[PDB]
């Protein structure tokens, strides 16, 4: 598992984890007011 960590640091794996980690704002856009206009926060 020496290079298994290195393969998990590759460009596609960092890409997919970055998209799902920044895109998990599902819980941020459902926890409080799923509709948030410009002048309402």
Partner 1 sequence: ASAATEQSPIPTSFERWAKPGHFDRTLARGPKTTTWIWNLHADAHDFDSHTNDLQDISRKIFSAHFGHLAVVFVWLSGMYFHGARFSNFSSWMADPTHIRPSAQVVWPLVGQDILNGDMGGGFRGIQITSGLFQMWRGEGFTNEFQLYCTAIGALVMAGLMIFAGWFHYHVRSPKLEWFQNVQSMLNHHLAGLLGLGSLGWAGHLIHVALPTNKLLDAGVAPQDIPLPHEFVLDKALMAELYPSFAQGIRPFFTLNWATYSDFLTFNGGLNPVTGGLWMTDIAHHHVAIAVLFIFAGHMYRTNWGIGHSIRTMLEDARHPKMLPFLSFIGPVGHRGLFEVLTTSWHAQLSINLAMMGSLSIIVAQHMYSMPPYPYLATDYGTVTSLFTHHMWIGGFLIVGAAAHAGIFMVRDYDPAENVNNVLDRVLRHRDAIISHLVWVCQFLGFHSFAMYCHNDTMRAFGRPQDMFSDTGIQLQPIFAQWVQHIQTMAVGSTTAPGVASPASYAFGGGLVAVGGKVAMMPISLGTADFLIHHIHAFTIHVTVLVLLKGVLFARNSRLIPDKSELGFRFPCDGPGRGGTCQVSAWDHVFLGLFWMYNSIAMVIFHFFWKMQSDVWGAVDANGTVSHITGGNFAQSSITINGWLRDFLWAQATQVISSYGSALSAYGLMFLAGHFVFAFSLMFLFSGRGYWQELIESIVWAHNKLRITTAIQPRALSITQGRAVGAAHYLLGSIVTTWAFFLARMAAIG
Partner 2 sequence: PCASSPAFNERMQNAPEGYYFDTPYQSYAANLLCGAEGLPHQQLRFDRAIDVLIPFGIFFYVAGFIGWSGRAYLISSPEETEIFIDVALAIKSFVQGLLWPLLAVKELTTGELTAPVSEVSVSP
**Interface with partner 1 by CB under 8 A: which residues?**
1-4, 6-7, 10-11, 26, 29-30, 34-35
Distances (CA, A) of 15 to 4, 12, 19, 36, 41: 17, 5, 6, 28, 30
Q: Give how many residues touch partner 2 by CB under 8 A.
A: 14
**Cα–Cα distance measured from residue 24 to residue 18, given in angstroms and rounded to the nearest whole number:** 10
Q: 26 is in the binding site of which of partner 1, partner 2, none (Cβ under 5 to 8 A by kind)? A: partner 1
Residues 1-41 that bind partner 2 (CB under 8 A): 6, 9-11, 14, 33-41
């Amino acid at each position: 598992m020496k290079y298994f960590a290195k393969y998990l640091t590759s460009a596609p794996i960092m890409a997919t984890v970055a998209l799902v980690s920044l895109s998990v704002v599902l819980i941020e856009l459902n926890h409080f007011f799923p509709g948030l206009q410009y002048g309402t926060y």
